[PDB]
């Protein structure tokens, strides 16, 4: 017997939906769910989704509370739907997927991923849940994560980090590095070799390699010398040119991180969703240099150096395809006389 | 085990709350309750109250569906709250009372009227429900209806009509005429002699006496002649004077019914609620005669005639008090040279 | 080049979406679309659906304005979606189907019904639109209407009436009687023999047979005599029994039409949607007789007589199944000593 | 002459309601109050309450702007209502009490606490306001605060801290330590001996005893030695065990404070109201250790040490009742071989 | 062809409105605009204005993204409207002006500032845009900014700082110091000599003169000695008196900044708009000293010292008019025996 009042009972007593039995009285007004405590209304949930408030509330309450892949990964792998859980998109305060399977009666298209409506959809499977590996094997389309080996299935090692209740972390008391597997049209698919973005914040940025410690700590010319980067235009691409009204380059998070220690800036996240490459409308507070569409990626600097050094530098412009978070990221590479002018995530 | 979804199940399957087990999926968007029937949303309920939508939905579902006293009677008797039912106020599309007893967890102030919070409240008790005559005996404050005698109480015989799911009617297959009993601070009251308003509609007005039949058939002058009404200002009070910009008189529903057969008019119900006297801002379409605050009452014409013939006509202006629907209705009586000038429910 | 403002232009200038170029200024406040005409705002559209206001506005604008099958027929045939039109459900003030094909960018699951997401969906195809009979041939699942023969398909002749901009009618200047054809998993179905409900209103009820004329004119006893209906419980089933608190019988629209000429009653439509059988919570004003869940169907009286005379009357109670509007309507038949006691659409 | 526009006049000119006379024009849209400044709308108030926006606005404007007891205290003492002021709950952005006395015409149940409706309610009285001590003496139920001595009334010394416009502080230019007194059913009640929670934030945590300076500054084993805490499981209870997927212990705010210097964590406040014991759904960012329902209290460490040391350690499990903020807080005490396994606020 | 979907296309692809062609599907619900990315809704804009959501969205998208005068300046100069751009008020999340010219069809009063409706309005002109200087010359009323010299027009040097996408900054890669000119009734007006407020935050405060470095760094008595301020009551006016329940003085931002390093405090911005003098309801966290209406201005300390030293100190009270941000700010000057008691922005 699922119900609004039972969902709120679990939220109040168990911090989330926990299969417990019971009911608390609830009031819904506009987009907010409340419950009486000591005779007054206490807010339990503000619906920021495009779903009816009582539906969003239940989905939220039923969010997966184990570490799960970050939404950008699931998106990059073409996931449409999850088997019998909810991947909550903490960046959008909303379900990451439109529909559900076996979760909620207003949004379910199916009780079980074996139902024929699920066969064209890429269904997300969690091998930490009993039976879900088997259900991947039987599904026409899907993405499977496991903590270990699945007999016969060639694994792809995913990122180190996963999301636990909206916190992106590398697990220590829990495991966040998964094997990933994918199936299209009944056929297991080979996951490409790939880099992974690092998912760091600008407020909390911590380097993760001696090279990155050097970038944060050394002056620009020292660092460029020490890692033999002459002619690669990190002055522009990574350090950022703030001298003109249009802010130049500045496409690596670590570069933003360096600048942020010195002076603040505004990042307007005008498409606020999780993705491998982010676009910001950036305004530098110190200089007033700015740019409407500044693509930023958080690659380990080591990885970005390896990508740019591996490039042929003998054409004016070309599109360079790099596989990142399993998706194929296009960059624009502009050169002159065998040195880099600029290299940036291509704006689409 | 009360729940939004169970209430909706009862509505969908039983036309109203009926204590049945079950659940349907529900969605709430702003003030409307919908349910999914075969993949599309069907409107179950639009909240017109000042309560949270899911709360109003449940009180509406749990409305009393037996003939019950009209809200105007309950209010005139000082009823605060009903015992274990909801008197639905179809004139306000809202619960007639703030709080409930033993009905709904969000609005209940008690489960049983015997709890101490109910003692100072005038509680409504329905003798047709097992045990409620008893509970009225224990109750410090209350109003009781019954269909027949109660041993040791003198009854007050109420109106002929009652409200069945919002239709006011004189029951032929069900009883609508109740015995009334009232208790203030543990003492059974002697209810006053009272007239009753008749609760008719302007559109479907039906005479209930030979005098009313004659009023509808005859011409003004004939009717006034037959019933010896010269000098009582019915021309003004009951027929209505449409010759000036201020619509004159027209304070008796039968007079509005008579005019509405010939030519129509606008009645603006600017305090929409059930009350013994109604105030309308009335605009006569044929003539443009209008009045901002036109008090209207539906008295049996014979009872109105009795009231007006029972007054002293020798002072220019005074307040005349008349018990109606158990409440004291003040009238203004204006006279000149021993005849009536006007007589109207006071606009105080 | 679809846009809010272009849709509004079409509404304002063409009464509906018509593919015209142009733009008017629009403003959206909560669920209402307005447009500026000479400096003030005029209401174009109030959203009563569960879709976003601008989305519902566009689907409403793009409604099919040719006579189309009533929604109850489409649902009974299992239609999921329409090919390149919107069947507007005037009973719910909402789109009849969740999704669209080739109509609206927010709701389209495809541009053409031939895309693979449509193959498992039962698609509605209108033979009056060039190419759609063809598309029905390629379609794995579908329902097709036409005005005339289709070479190589046996037709099923549908109802006389269809819905034109929300008015159900039997077309005299346009055709409303369609041939129906259905395909499940690539196989043309043989549609069952079926009766059709007549889709009449209680207010403007018009007899469509000499028996129905007689039913309206004659007294109960005469009519029952003329048509040899003794022992079939029409007194209860069709005339309705208003003598007890439970309103008895009254399951056939013509019986409600007959009563409504004499005295009025409340029909509460608590699941407002188009369906072959309707459930009303009905309160008779003259008598106070009432019933929470009164199933009503509008069958030609002759067809109802044929159904009831085609049953075995020898068991106390059983389920009688009758194809109507192409769907299986269960009835309860109650008999005693070889005569009918009652017979009603099952309240399951 | 109270009015929306007068309330807004005071807000604009006096920062809050100040009995001043005057009016500014106001516009209300959805849940927000605005006023024109220099021809544009400036937001004055966003209603986060379940009250009508214009009502919440007035209550907010009339909030008590003297230091007042924190809402958890008033709750723990059973306060239902305040005499002639509003205790604004800054943590819920809402009135702490449902109704008022002498404040606001939509929410008043009474103009004065002597009215008989107030007698069953525990009314909050402020002896800094003239007459309110006397009104406590006459009230059947109440809680009284004073700055000094009340002849005959045995005092209870309240917490050091009070809330001033939502800032919890120990007063220096103002007095925040009150005498508390309580009355149930006409009878002064003896307030229990009690500890008080410290009301500290995790961002702003300052130790308040040499012991607490030691906890923050020393390593875990040093501190446990220096205060002879071997066998008392502060390793678990206070320091927190982050080694397993379920975060172990961690029920004292100061322990959260220590960890927060090292690494951040997420505290989901899923019942956001003021209370003596808080429940969080906690996710540790460094380790990914987490717990759905982690009870946290902010006792001075000295006080928590005194509580746990005073316990008999010779049973496996028992419920230990401790009086905190005047309410009786249950703890679970789990022991083995005369040492503490775990000791935590009992989850209800 | 302007449209909701075209505006959203520009927002998504260009970070703001950029004249580009194209459309994305959009959904509007309540006050929020969304668009599909990867099958789910992503929030593009939350309407905090009193305009219809789709109108506010377009105005926002069309905001001027060059450095522009801070709204307080435009207000102080009497600007009603901007020529062919939108000055977005980032402090109110709303257009700074009610109407537009040549921007948006719901809010435009004119396509061009030469239209006769614009002649009484003070129109804001931007000489960085071609033709706009000329349009100032022809306008009956206006305010013009330029980066350089305009032949014949006597300039006023504006503030050093301007606002770029809501960041107030002194330009280095861009120019933020403008010449200002004003016209009333066809006649160029002489802008007064004036100080300028510094527009600093309390979190980010940086001194801007050796004097201000001294104020932040030195003790109170040192600083007062070093700059010969004895008898000028900076102890009160600038340092702030926290000893009594009413917080004394404290009207210079730098004084708040000093205190904030030591201890925090609450500033309730109860009229949140940009202005030259701000009013806060201030609560000091350390002492609980507070004040409902504390006027604060951010003058360079040098400038404030120069203002107060220039005053005659020989009257008890007088109104002192100082021109700041071009508007005439009244101060109250209270003296005794030729020393300053208090000096503060006059409360109106
Ligand atoms: C306090 N007295 C009282 O209630 N009396 C009574 C009530 C109901 C029926 C008959 C009775 F006598
Ligand atoms: C799969 N078969 C099929 O569709 N057949 C057919 C369809 C429409 C008209 C005539 C036909 F023969």
PDB file of N, CA, C and O in Angstrom, chain A residues 271-320:
ATOM      1  N   UNK A 271      23.149  26.624 -18.578  1.00  0.00           N
ATOM      2  CA  UNK A 271      22.458  25.344 -18.814  1.00  0.00           C
ATOM      3  C   UNK A 271      22.798  24.433 -17.645  1.00  0.00           C
ATOM      4  O   UNK A 271      23.614  23.520 -17.798  1.00  0.00           O
ATOM      5  N   UNK A 272      22.225  24.639 -16.473  1.00  0.00           N
ATOM      6  CA  UNK A 272      22.685  23.899 -15.296  1.00  0.00           C
ATOM      7  C   UNK A 272      22.294  22.427 -15.322  1.00  0.00           C
ATOM      8  O   UNK A 272      21.319  22.016 -14.703  1.00  0.00           O
ATOM      9  N   UNK A 273      23.050  21.625 -16.045  1.00  0.00           N
ATOM     10  CA  UNK A 273      22.985  20.183 -15.927  1.00  0.00           C
ATOM     11  C   UNK A 273      24.403  19.642 -15.799  1.00  0.00           C
ATOM     12  O   UNK A 273      25.380  20.308 -16.125  1.00  0.00           O
ATOM     13  N   UNK A 274      24.525  18.432 -15.307  1.00  0.00           N
ATOM     14  CA  UNK A 274      25.827  17.766 -15.272  1.00  0.00           C
ATOM     15  C   UNK A 274      26.291  17.483 -16.697  1.00  0.00           C
ATOM     16  O   UNK A 274      25.566  16.811 -17.440  1.00  0.00           O
ATOM     17  N   UNK A 275      27.470  17.977 -17.116  1.00  0.00           N
ATOM     18  CA  UNK A 275      28.008  17.363 -18.339  1.00  0.00           C
ATOM     19  C   UNK A 275      29.534  17.388 -18.411  1.00  0.00           C
ATOM     20  O   UNK A 275      30.230  18.053 -17.633  1.00  0.00           O
ATOM     21  N   UNK A 276      30.042  16.603 -19.364  1.00  0.00           N
ATOM     22  CA  UNK A 276      31.481  16.424 -19.473  1.00  0.00           C
ATOM     23  C   UNK A 276      32.165  17.756 -19.736  1.00  0.00           C
ATOM     24  O   UNK A 276      33.153  18.081 -19.077  1.00  0.00           O
ATOM     25  N   UNK A 277      31.623  18.562 -20.651  1.00  0.00           N
ATOM     26  CA  UNK A 277      32.083  19.929 -20.895  1.00  0.00           C
ATOM     27  C   UNK A 277      31.009  20.900 -20.413  1.00  0.00           C
ATOM     28  O   UNK A 277      29.842  20.772 -20.796  1.00  0.00           O
ATOM     29  N   UNK A 278      31.391  21.863 -19.587  1.00  0.00           N
ATOM     30  CA  UNK A 278      30.456  22.856 -19.094  1.00  0.00           C
ATOM     31  C   UNK A 278      30.646  24.151 -19.867  1.00  0.00           C
ATOM     32  O   UNK A 278      31.755  24.482 -20.292  1.00  0.00           O
ATOM     33  N   UNK A 279      29.552  24.873 -20.096  1.00  0.00           N
ATOM     34  CA  UNK A 279      29.628  26.209 -20.689  1.00  0.00           C
ATOM     35  C   UNK A 279      29.236  27.266 -19.660  1.00  0.00           C
ATOM     36  O   UNK A 279      28.177  27.166 -19.021  1.00  0.00           O
ATOM     37  N   UNK A 280      30.098  28.263 -19.473  1.00  0.00           N
ATOM     38  CA  UNK A 280      29.744  29.346 -18.570  1.00  0.00           C
ATOM     39  C   UNK A 280      29.843  30.676 -19.277  1.00  0.00           C
ATOM     40  O   UNK A 280      30.621  30.848 -20.227  1.00  0.00           O
ATOM     41  N   UNK A 281      29.020  31.604 -18.826  1.00  0.00           N
ATOM     42  CA  UNK A 281      29.184  32.988 -19.209  1.00  0.00           C
ATOM     43  C   UNK A 281      30.024  33.606 -18.084  1.00  0.00           C
ATOM     44  O   UNK A 281      29.580  33.725 -16.932  1.00  0.00           O
ATOM     45  N   UNK A 282      31.297  33.854 -18.395  1.00  0.00           N
ATOM     46  CA  UNK A 282      32.283  34.176 -17.364  1.00  0.00           C
ATOM     47  C   UNK A 282      32.618  35.674 -17.369  1.00  0.00           C
ATOM     48  O   UNK A 282      32.825  36.282 -18.429  1.00  0.00           O
ATOM     49  N   UNK A 283      32.662  36.263 -16.174  1.00  0.00           N
ATOM     50  CA  UNK A 283      33.000  37.666 -15.976  1.00  0.00           C
ATOM     51  C   UNK A 283      34.100  37.729 -14.931  1.00  0.00           C
ATOM     52  O   UNK A 283      33.872  37.361 -13.775  1.00  0.00           O
ATOM     53  N   UNK A 284      35.271  38.209 -15.321  1.00  0.00           N
ATOM     54  CA  UNK A 284      36.391  38.304 -14.400  1.00  0.00           C
ATOM     55  C   UNK A 284      36.280  39.569 -13.554  1.00  0.00           C
ATOM     56  O   UNK A 284      36.233  40.683 -14.099  1.00  0.00           O
ATOM     57  N   UNK A 285      36.242  39.416 -12.222  1.00  0.00           N
ATOM     58  CA  UNK A 285      35.938  40.573 -11.368  1.00  0.00           C
ATOM     59  C   UNK A 285      37.057  41.605 -11.355  1.00  0.00           C
ATOM     60  O   UNK A 285      36.780  42.802 -11.221  1.00  0.00           O
ATOM     61  N   UNK A 286      38.309  41.168 -11.472  1.00  0.00           N
ATOM     62  CA  UNK A 286      39.436  42.081 -11.370  1.00  0.00           C
ATOM     63  C   UNK A 286      39.553  42.971 -12.609  1.00  0.00           C
ATOM     64  O   UNK A 286      39.759  44.196 -12.497  1.00  0.00           O
ATOM     65  N   UNK A 287      39.455  42.369 -13.796  1.00  0.00           N
ATOM     66  CA  UNK A 287      39.746  43.069 -15.042  1.00  0.00           C
ATOM     67  C   UNK A 287      38.498  43.482 -15.818  1.00  0.00           C
ATOM     68  O   UNK A 287      38.588  44.380 -16.678  1.00  0.00           O
ATOM     69  N   UNK A 288      37.353  42.844 -15.543  1.00  0.00           N
ATOM     70  CA  UNK A 288      36.181  42.990 -16.357  1.00  0.00           C
ATOM     71  C   UNK A 288      36.268  42.327 -17.707  1.00  0.00           C
ATOM     72  O   UNK A 288      35.341  42.485 -18.529  1.00  0.00           O
ATOM     73  N   UNK A 289      37.357  41.625 -17.993  1.00  0.00           N
ATOM     74  CA  UNK A 289      37.375  40.724 -19.142  1.00  0.00           C
ATOM     75  C   UNK A 289      36.235  39.697 -19.020  1.00  0.00           C
ATOM     76  O   UNK A 289      35.949  39.207 -17.924  1.00  0.00           O
ATOM     77  N   UNK A 290      35.576  39.359 -20.127  1.00  0.00           N
ATOM     78  CA  UNK A 290      34.486  38.388 -20.026  1.00  0.00           C
ATOM     79  C   UNK A 290      34.322  37.591 -21.331  1.00  0.00           C
ATOM     80  O   UNK A 290      34.969  37.884 -22.347  1.00  0.00           O
ATOM     81  N   UNK A 291      33.449  36.562 -21.286  1.00  0.00           N
ATOM     82  CA  UNK A 291      33.105  35.730 -22.450  1.00  0.00           C
ATOM     83  C   UNK A 291      31.756  35.033 -22.218  1.00  0.00           C
ATOM     84  O   UNK A 291      31.545  34.385 -21.182  1.00  0.00           O
ATOM     85  N   UNK A 292      30.856  35.163 -23.194  1.00  0.00           N
ATOM     86  CA  UNK A 292      29.500  34.613 -23.097  1.00  0.00           C
ATOM     87  C   UNK A 292      29.498  33.092 -22.985  1.00  0.00           C
ATOM     88  O   UNK A 292      28.707  32.509 -22.234  1.00  0.00           O
ATOM     89  N   UNK A 293      30.292  32.424 -23.809  1.00  0.00           N
ATOM     90  CA  UNK A 293      30.247  30.967 -23.920  1.00  0.00           C
ATOM     91  C   UNK A 293      31.693  30.499 -23.758  1.00  0.00           C
ATOM     92  O   UNK A 293      32.493  30.499 -24.709  1.00  0.00           O
ATOM     93  N   UNK A 294      32.065  30.211 -22.526  1.00  0.00           N
ATOM     94  CA  UNK A 294      33.396  29.757 -22.179  1.00  0.00           C
ATOM     95  C   UNK A 294      33.273  28.294 -21.829  1.00  0.00           C
ATOM     96  O   UNK A 294      32.769  27.963 -20.749  1.00  0.00           O
ATOM     97  N   UNK A 295      33.731  27.421 -22.726  1.00  0.00           N
ATOM     98  CA  UNK A 295      33.704  25.995 -22.404  1.00  0.00           C
ATOM     99  C   UNK A 295      34.821  25.651 -21.419  1.00  0.00           C
ATOM    100  O   UNK A 295      35.956  26.101 -21.569  1.00  0.00           O
ATOM    101  N   UNK A 296      34.473  24.915 -20.368  1.00  0.00           N
ATOM    102  CA  UNK A 296      35.405  24.486 -19.338  1.00  0.00           C
ATOM    103  C   UNK A 296      35.245  22.992 -19.150  1.00  0.00           C
ATOM    104  O   UNK A 296      34.117  22.501 -19.039  1.00  0.00           O
ATOM    105  N   UNK A 297      36.373  22.279 -19.103  1.00  0.00           N
ATOM    106  CA  UNK A 297      36.446  20.866 -18.739  1.00  0.00           C
ATOM    107  C   UNK A 297      37.416  20.702 -17.576  1.00  0.00           C
ATOM    108  O   UNK A 297      38.364  21.481 -17.415  1.00  0.00           O
ATOM    109  N   UNK A 298      37.150  19.716 -16.732  1.00  0.00           N
ATOM    110  CA  UNK A 298      38.039  19.404 -15.620  1.00  0.00           C
ATOM    111  C   UNK A 298      38.747  18.095 -15.942  1.00  0.00           C
ATOM    112  O   UNK A 298      38.349  17.030 -15.474  1.00  0.00           O
ATOM    113  N   UNK A 299      39.785  18.177 -16.781  1.00  0.00           N
ATOM    114  CA  UNK A 299      40.728  17.066 -16.962  1.00  0.00           C
ATOM    115  C   UNK A 299      41.876  17.221 -15.985  1.00  0.00           C
ATOM    116  O   UNK A 299      42.291  18.344 -15.674  1.00  0.00           O
ATOM    117  N   UNK A 300      42.370  16.102 -15.481  1.00  0.00           N
ATOM    118  CA  UNK A 300      43.683  16.109 -14.863  1.00  0.00           C
ATOM    119  C   UNK A 300      44.651  16.763 -15.827  1.00  0.00           C
ATOM    120  O   UNK A 300      44.604  16.514 -17.035  1.00  0.00           O
ATOM    121  N   UNK A 301      45.505  17.636 -15.303  1.00  0.00           N
ATOM    122  CA  UNK A 301      46.352  18.424 -16.200  1.00  0.00           C
ATOM    123  C   UNK A 301      47.267  17.520 -17.022  1.00  0.00           C
ATOM    124  O   UNK A 301      47.359  17.666 -18.249  1.00  0.00           O
ATOM    125  N   UNK A 302      47.927  16.562 -16.357  1.00  0.00           N
ATOM    126  CA  UNK A 302      48.635  15.446 -16.977  1.00  0.00           C
ATOM    127  C   UNK A 302      47.896  14.947 -18.218  1.00  0.00           C
ATOM    128  O   UNK A 302      48.482  14.845 -19.300  1.00  0.00           O
ATOM    129  N   UNK A 303      46.602  14.628 -18.069  1.00  0.00           N
ATOM    130  CA  UNK A 303      45.849  14.116 -19.207  1.00  0.00           C
ATOM    131  C   UNK A 303      45.703  15.176 -20.288  1.00  0.00           C
ATOM    132  O   UNK A 303      45.775  14.863 -21.479  1.00  0.00           O
ATOM    133  N   UNK A 304      45.475  16.436 -19.905  1.00  0.00           N
ATOM    134  CA  UNK A 304      45.301  17.453 -20.939  1.00  0.00           C
ATOM    135  C   UNK A 304      46.608  17.706 -21.687  1.00  0.00           C
ATOM    136  O   UNK A 304      46.597  17.870 -22.917  1.00  0.00           O
ATOM    137  N   UNK A 305      47.732  17.755 -20.955  1.00  0.00           N
ATOM    138  CA  UNK A 305      49.065  17.850 -21.573  1.00  0.00           C
ATOM    139  C   UNK A 305      49.295  16.710 -22.555  1.00  0.00           C
ATOM    140  O   UNK A 305      49.776  16.931 -23.677  1.00  0.00           O
ATOM    141  N   UNK A 306      48.940  15.477 -22.158  1.00  0.00           N
ATOM    142  CA  UNK A 306      49.135  14.327 -23.034  1.00  0.00           C
ATOM    143  C   UNK A 306      48.292  14.449 -24.289  1.00  0.00           C
ATOM    144  O   UNK A 306      48.756  14.123 -25.393  1.00  0.00           O
ATOM    145  N   UNK A 307      47.073  14.970 -24.157  1.00  0.00           N
ATOM    146  CA  UNK A 307      46.200  15.120 -25.316  1.00  0.00           C
ATOM    147  C   UNK A 307      46.776  16.138 -26.291  1.00  0.00           C
ATOM    148  O   UNK A 307      46.816  15.905 -27.515  1.00  0.00           O
ATOM    149  N   UNK A 308      47.207  17.298 -25.773  1.00  0.00           N
ATOM    150  CA  UNK A 308      47.608  18.373 -26.680  1.00  0.00           C
ATOM    151  C   UNK A 308      48.975  18.065 -27.290  1.00  0.00           C
ATOM    152  O   UNK A 308      49.200  18.295 -28.486  1.00  0.00           O
ATOM    153  N   UNK A 309      49.892  17.488 -26.500  1.00  0.00           N
ATOM    154  CA  UNK A 309      51.200  17.148 -27.051  1.00  0.00           C
ATOM    155  C   UNK A 309      51.100  16.105 -28.163  1.00  0.00           C
ATOM    156  O   UNK A 309      51.893  16.141 -29.112  1.00  0.00           O
ATOM    157  N   UNK A 310      50.094  15.228 -28.117  1.00  0.00           N
ATOM    158  CA  UNK A 310      49.979  14.156 -29.097  1.00  0.00           C
ATOM    159  C   UNK A 310      49.487  14.632 -30.456  1.00  0.00           C
ATOM    160  O   UNK A 310      49.328  13.806 -31.367  1.00  0.00           O
ATOM    161  N   UNK A 311      49.236  15.924 -30.614  1.00  0.00           N
ATOM    162  CA  UNK A 311      48.566  16.448 -31.795  1.00  0.00           C
ATOM    163  C   UNK A 311      49.562  16.830 -32.873  1.00  0.00           C
ATOM    164  O   UNK A 311      50.642  17.340 -32.584  1.00  0.00           O
ATOM    165  N   UNK A 312      49.174  16.611 -34.123  1.00  0.00           N
ATOM    166  CA  UNK A 312      49.904  17.199 -35.227  1.00  0.00           C
ATOM    167  C   UNK A 312      49.623  18.697 -35.259  1.00  0.00           C
ATOM    168  O   UNK A 312      48.458  19.120 -35.264  1.00  0.00           O
ATOM    169  N   UNK A 313      50.685  19.503 -35.313  1.00  0.00           N
ATOM    170  CA  UNK A 313      50.572  20.957 -35.236  1.00  0.00           C
ATOM    171  C   UNK A 313      50.763  21.662 -36.583  1.00  0.00           C
ATOM    172  O   UNK A 313      51.157  22.830 -36.623  1.00  0.00           O
ATOM    173  N   UNK A 314      50.472  21.001 -37.700  1.00  0.00           N
ATOM    174  CA  UNK A 314      50.911  21.531 -38.986  1.00  0.00           C
ATOM    175  C   UNK A 314      49.762  21.985 -39.881  1.00  0.00           C
ATOM    176  O   UNK A 314      49.953  22.159 -41.086  1.00  0.00           O
ATOM    177  N   UNK A 315      48.580  22.181 -39.327  1.00  0.00           N
ATOM    178  CA  UNK A 315      47.438  22.685 -40.075  1.00  0.00           C
ATOM    179  C   UNK A 315      46.920  23.908 -39.337  1.00  0.00           C
ATOM    180  O   UNK A 315      47.185  24.085 -38.143  1.00  0.00           O
ATOM    181  N   UNK A 316      46.216  24.781 -40.058  1.00  0.00           N
ATOM    182  CA  UNK A 316      45.688  25.983 -39.414  1.00  0.00           C
ATOM    183  C   UNK A 316      44.612  25.598 -38.409  1.00  0.00           C
ATOM    184  O   UNK A 316      44.658  25.995 -37.238  1.00  0.00           O
ATOM    185  N   UNK A 317      43.650  24.789 -38.848  1.00  0.00           N
ATOM    186  CA  UNK A 317      42.501  24.455 -38.033  1.00  0.00           C
ATOM    187  C   UNK A 317      42.127  23.020 -38.315  1.00  0.00           C
ATOM    188  O   UNK A 317      42.137  22.604 -39.472  1.00  0.00           O
ATOM    189  N   UNK A 318      41.799  22.267 -37.273  1.00  0.00           N
ATOM    190  CA  UNK A 318      41.151  20.981 -37.514  1.00  0.00           C
ATOM    191  C   UNK A 318      40.347  20.573 -36.286  1.00  0.00           C
ATOM    192  O   UNK A 318      40.586  21.046 -35.174  1.00  0.00           O
ATOM    193  N   UNK A 319      39.365  19.716 -36.510  1.00  0.00           N
ATOM    194  CA  UNK A 319      38.572  19.164 -35.422  1.00  0.00           C
ATOM    195  C   UNK A 319      39.297  17.942 -34.875  1.00  0.00           C
ATOM    196  O   UNK A 319      39.627  17.019 -35.625  1.00  0.00           O
ATOM    197  N   UNK A 320      39.577  17.947 -33.576  1.00  0.00           N
ATOM    198  CA  UNK A 320      40.263  16.853 -32.896  1.00  0.00           C
ATOM    199  C   UNK A 320      39.254  16.164 -31.974  1.00  0.00           C
ATOM    200  O   UNK A 320      38.683  16.803 -31.082  1.00  0.00           O
TER     201      UNK A 320
END
